[PDB]
Each structure stands twice: as structure tokens, then as C-alpha cells.
From a paper:
The enzyme 15-prostaglandin dehydrogenase ([name]) is a key negative regulator of tissue stem cell activity in proliferation and in the repair of tissue injury, whose negative regulation of tissue regeneration is conserved across multiple organs. [name] acts via its NAD+-dependent enzymatic activity of oxidizing and degrading prostaglandin E2 (PGE2), and related eicosanoids, which provide key trophic support for stem cells in multiple tissues. Specifically, [name] catalyzes the rate-limiting step to initiate PGE2 degradation by oxidizing the 15-hydroxyl moiety of PGE2 to a 15-keto group, thereby inactivating PGE2 from being able to bind to its receptors. [name] assembled as a homodimer, which is the proposed physiological form of the enzyme.
To examine the generality of the molecular interactions that govern [name] inhibition, we expanded our investigation to include a newer generation of [name] inhibitors, SW22274613 that represents an entirely different chemical scaffold. [name], has a similar IC50 as (+)-SW209415, but is based on a quinoxaline scaffold that is chemically distinct from the thienopyridine-based structure of (+)-SW209415. We used cryo-EM to define the molecular interactions of [name]-bound to [name], which were interpreted from the structure determined with an average resolution of 2.9 Å. Strikingly, [name] occupies a nearly identical pocket as that of (+)-SW209415, while using different chemical groups to maintain critical interactions with key [name] residues. Specifically, as was the case with (+)-SW209415, [name] is fully encapsulated in the drug binding pocket with the α10-α12 lid of [name] closed around it. Similar to (+)-SW209415, the closing of the lid again appears to be orchestrated through π-stacking interactions coordinated through F185 and Y217 of [name] with the quinoxaline and quinoline-2(1H)- moieties, respectively, of [name]. The amide carbonyl group of [name] replaces the (+)-SW209415 sulfoxide and maintains the specific recognition of the catalytic core of the enzyme through, again, a hydrogen bonding network formed with the critical S138 and Y151 residues. The piperidine moiety of [name] replaces the butyl chain of (+)-SW209415 to maintain hydrophobic interactions as well. For example, the thienopyridine of (+)-SW209415 reaches into the catalytic pocket to form a hydrogen bond (amine group at position 3) with Q148 of [name], whereas [name] does not form any interactions with Q148. Additionally, the elongated quinoxaline and quinoline-2(1H)-one moiety of [name] form interactions with T246 within the β7 strand of [name] that is not observed for (+)-SW209415 binding to the protein, and interactions with Y217 are stronger for [name] than for (+)-SW209415.
Numbering used by the authors:
A (entry chain B), B (entry chain A): 2 to 256
The structure:
């Protein structure tokens, strides 16, 4: 069940994040959208208000790269609603010129948010348990030539997820950690490859990514949401890596 | 071959780095030791001077985390031996309490050093070619419960190496990138898993990894040097993952 549970989704004003938020609110959940984009977040919240209830959503503007901001955002989330049951970490960028910030946002922020969610969720620290869902890509399971740091960040995310799952199992925290790896999703992050200001030296080789995209296909963000509702609804699923593609669909990386 | 080539090996004051430096100097290559430990580097340099020629070693104190020092160390290394031919990125600290520093030292520093090596080594830019070998662990392709962020860093190293190999093949830089994934190697980093000021919250489960170490045995740093020499000697090896264990031995991750 999801009804009555509090969900905290990072970067949920557009793309996959807002699809996750819509799915969670459809199943019934008080949802906190945190995002560093003020206008995008306000527009997303005002759109979600029209079909859902006004009081089941809460927008917070914060940069997940900052640590004090993330801690204070978690403080506001748990203060407003009251608890925390689902934590989805999907705030990624495709900047290769400033790859340091890309690594700080994709990987460091994921681990920091996971630790904060364990702080506010683990039974040892006081809580009932829950789920923490980390969003990686198939780049975390296979190499991508035109974006090395993004591949490294996704690999780090998947490794950290499938190790922290075993850790949390050992610590009796009651928190189950799973990772979601989509293929290509029709979002804005897909048009970033076409620009050199966040691609840099690899802007000359952006055609290979387009060829791969055409060969495989493009996934609707709603379908990705069906993955999130599938891991949450299953209690006996800890550390499993969800893979979403076109031909196969929603399956798992049998390790 | 490395009969007269120049190698920048990282973290060569002690442990695996010292074995790499000894092997390379035995083969005939000038070696630039880099370390953040003044005394540990000075003693290693004195020993290597007493063994090999005085002029084939150059010790430079630098913290690989600091970007300015790292780019101001490559400058002196290339301003001393003239060229750069081998780049061994080997600098890992196990510290889960300050996991931000661990991530910065293990993953960010390796990527920055690889980018500097491509800047100073790519055939199209001003160079001739060479090899960049990033040191990883078997935890780079397996989950480890008692150290999640270390697993994430190693997964990032593996993914970045695998992707950057294809990238460098695509840009015609002539630089070959490979990664090494040893098992348990008898060094001074295994004593850090028995320290609560170094492992933090996972110090109650160090027995689980100690059981694994006793089970798979331990490895001699000379074997990792043999693996490095095997990687460098073969010109048809780009992106191959180097696995060293005690039963199979030196072999490759067949992806
Ligand atoms: N869209 C795709 O085709 C794929 C995306 N993913 C992953 O899904 C995640 C999100 O999906 P996208 O398609 O990229 O959506 P997107 O284009 O909407 O980008 C994610 C959103 O997160 C927010 N965000 C970014 N950096 C942030 C930060 N530092 N602090 C707070 N909020 C921040 C922004 O609102 C941004 O629009 C990313 O981590 C991405 O790597 C996974 C596989 C493929
Ligand atoms: N020893 C083992 O059993 C395993 C080790 N490794 C890898 O080997 C490396 C560790 O070397 P070991 O010989 O095992 O032990 P070690 O800890 O003695 O070697 C690492 C050395 O690197 C240097 N170093 C650390 N941080 C630095 C920094 N920021 N700047 C400059 N120098 C720095 C220090 O001199 C340090 O002693 C790591 O890269 C680790 O991932 C891989 C698999 C298992
Ligand atoms: C059957 N099959 C087999 C292989 C396969 C591989 C991929 C596949 C392969 N490289 C990828 C590299 C990067 C990303 C990614 O995160 N991006 C894109 C760029 C913008 C940022 C967001 C996704 C990828 N996705 C997708 C589908 C299939 C597939 O359906
Ligand atoms: C046949 N076989 C099969 C599996 C296997 C697994 C490992 C194996 C399994 N977890 C590992 C986890 C971490 C590290 C590591 O980097 N540390 C240790 C801690 C201090 C920092 C440095 C190495 C590991 N090494 C080793 C050998 C075999 C092996 O020989």
C-alpha cells in the first residue's frame, strides 16, 4: 500500500520526477517536490493542484548539491507532513564541461540524500522503515562513449545502492533500497546532448548517441512511473536493480 | 615497452604504488612519485635511490584532491623528464565517516588526473600516446556491505575507465585506458577496517569482511605490479578490466 504515506522526490518539477509525483499522488500519498528551479516547481505544483488535493503536495526550492540546504529541506519536509516513507532521488544533469558539478549532483547528492533518509527513516534512529529509490541509467550498467563522467556517476549510484541495501539489511533499519535504470526517456535532458555548452569536447561525437536512440527507442515517462509503483508495492525486493527498456520492458538485472 | 618512458604513478610512497614504482624502474622507466605524505615519500625515494639510479626517480608532494596542486604537479613532472608516457592513477583512502573526502580522493581525483593525462599525452594535441591505468578494486564490480561509498567510488572508476577507453579510441588520441581490480592485497589499508574513526557507523560489522579476507587469502603487491606490466606491454588492450585473485590469478572481466 501507498495510501497515507509521505513521499519525498528530488527534482520533481519536470520530466521523470513529476511523473513519479503524479503516480504517487494517484495512489494516494503526501508528496514533497524539492527542486532548485523556482518557476518550474511552482508551475508543476500549480498543475498538480488542479487534479489532486491542494494539501497533499509541498514544493521546496533547494539545491541538492548543497548539504546544509538538503538537511534543512529534510527538516521542513518532516516538520510539515510528519513522517517520511518513500524517498526518490532523481536530480541529474548532463554537463560534461563542468563535470565536477555533474559528479557532485548526480552521485554525491544521491549518497547524502540516502544517508539523510536513513537518518529520518531507520528504526534505529526512530521510525517505521520505508523505501529509498535511487535513479540511475543503463549507463550505470554499460559504457557510454560521449559522456564519461555521467557513466561514472551512474555506476557509482548503482554500486552504492546495491551495497547500502545489504548494509541496511544488516543494520535492521527496515529500509529497502532499490535502483531504477531507464533507457531513453522523452524529457528535456535529451536535448542537452545537442548543445556544446554542457557537452564540451564530445560535442563532435553526439551523432552516435542519436543513432543509438533511434535504434532502441524512446520511453514515455509514465511507464517509468510504473516501475516506481512496482518496487514500492513489493516488500520482498531489496537491492534489486530495475531495468526499463523498449523491447523487454520492466525487468531486473539478474546478478 | 617502457625502456625509456616516463611514468607518473600516484600514491607511490607505500603499498601497491611502491610496487608499481619498483617494477617500472626495474623495467627502465623514469618514475615521478606523487604523495601527500612527506616522510613516507622521502623514505620510499631514498630506498629507490639506494636500489635504482638516483636520476630515475622524482618525488613531488601533492594532494590529488586539490585541483590546483594536481595541475601544478603534472607541470613539474613534464618540466623535468620532458614527456609523459604512463599515468598510473592509484590513490585510495578508506574513510566512511568523512565519505565526502573519500569520494573526492577516489573518484573525482582519478577523473581529473585522467583528463590531465589526456591533455599532456593525446597524440592529436601535442603528444605521442601512452597508457593511463586507473587502479580500482574488485568491489568495483561486486557489492560490499560494510563500505558503500568505497564501492560507489570503485564502480565509478570502472565505468569511467570503460567509457573513456572508447572515447579516446574515438578521438584518435592514441591513449589507451585500462583498469585494475585486485582482490585483497596485503598493504597498510587493511588495518583501517578495524578503526571506528575510519569506518564510522560500519565498525560493528568489520567481522563480516574479515571473514571474507581470511577466506580468499591475501595478495602480494608484486603481483599487482606484474599485472601492471602485463597491461602496459600489450598494445591491443583498451578498456580491458584487470582482475587479480588468488585462485584464477591475472585474468580479464569478459563483458
Ligand atoms: N531522461 C532520460 O532519458 C534519462 C534520465 N535518467 C535520469 O533521470 C533523472 C531525471 O530525469 P531527466 O530526464 O534527467 O529529467 P529532467 O530533464 O527534468 O532533469 C531532472 C530535473 O531535476 C532537477 N534538478 C537537477 N539538478 C538539480 C539539483 N542539483 N538540485 C535540485 N534539483 C535538480 C531539475 O528540475 C531537472 O529538470 C536524472 O538523474 C537522469 O540521469 C535516467 C535514464 C535516462
Ligand atoms: N590494498 C588492498 O587490498 C586493495 C587496494 N586497492 C587499491 O589500492 C590503493 C591503496 O593502496 P595500498 O597499497 O592498498 O595501501 P595504502 O593505503 O598504503 O596506499 C595508498 C597510499 O596513497 C597515498 N595517498 C592517499 N591519498 C592521497 C592523496 N590525496 N594524495 C596523494 N597521495 C595519497 C598514501 O601514501 C597512501 O599510503 C587504492 O587505490 C585502493 O583502491 C585495491 C584493491 C584492494
Ligand atoms: C534492448 N536494449 C539494449 C540496449 C539498450 C541501451 C540503452 C542505453 C544505452 N546507452 C545509454 C547512455 C546514456 C543514457 C542516459 O542516461 N541518457 C541519454 C543522454 C542524455 C542523458 C540521459 C541512456 C542509455 N541507454 C537503451 C535501451 C537499450 C535497449 O532497449
Ligand atoms: C574467487 N574470488 C571470488 C570473489 C572475490 C572477492 C574479493 C573481494 C570482495 N570484496 C572486496 C571488498 C573490498 C575490497 C577492497 O578494495 N579493500 C578491502 C578493505 C579495505 C580497502 C581495500 C576488496 C574486495 N575483494 C576478493 C577475492 C575474490 C576471489 O578470489
Amino acid at each position: 500500500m501507498v495510501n497515507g504515506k509521505v513521499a519525498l522526490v528530488t527534482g520533481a518539477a519536470q520530466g521523470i520526477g513529476r511523473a513519479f509525483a503524479e503516480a504517487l499522488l494517484l495512489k494516494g500519498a503526501k508528496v514533497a517536490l524539492v527542486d532548485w528551479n523556482l518557476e518550474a516547481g511552482v508551475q508543476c505544483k500549480a498543475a498538480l493542484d488542479e487534479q489532486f488535493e491542494p494539501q497533499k503536495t509541498l514544493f521546496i526550492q533547494c539545491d541538492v548539491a548543497d548539504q546544509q540546504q538538503l538537511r534543512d529541506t529534510f527538516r521542513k519536509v518532516v516538520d510539515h507532513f510528519g513522517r517520511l516513507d518513500i524517498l526518490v532521488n532523481n536530480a541529474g544533469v548532463n554537463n560534461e564541461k563542468n563535470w565536477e558539478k555533474t559528479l557532485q549532483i548526480n552521485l554525491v547528492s544521491v549518497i547524502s540524500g540516502t544517508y539523510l533518509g536513513l537518518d529520518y527513516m531507520s528504526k534505529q534512529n526512530g521510525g517505521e522503515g520505508g523505501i529509498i529509490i535511487n535513479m540511475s541509467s543503463l549507463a550505470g550498467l554499460m559504457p557510454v562513449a560521449q559522456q564519461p563522467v555521467y557513466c561514472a556517476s551512474k555506476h557509482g549510484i548503482v554500486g552504492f545502492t546495491r551495497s547500502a541495501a545489504l548494509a541496511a539489511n544488516l543494520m535492521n533499519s527496515g529500509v529497502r533500497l532499490n535502483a531504477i535504470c531507464p533507457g531513453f526517456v522523452n524529457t528535456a535532458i535529451l536535448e542537452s546532448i545537442e548543445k556544446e555548452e554542457n557537452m564540451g569536447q564530445y560535442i563532435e561525437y553526439k551523432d552516435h548517441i542519436k543513432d543509438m536512440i533511434k535504434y532502441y527507442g524512446i520511453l514515455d515517462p509514465p511507464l517509468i512511473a510504473n516501475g516506481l509503483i512496482t518496487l514500492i508495492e513489493d516488500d520482498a525486493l531489496n537491492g534489486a536493480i530495475m531495468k526499463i527498456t523498449t523491447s523487454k520492458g520492466i525487468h531486473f538485472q539478474d546478478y
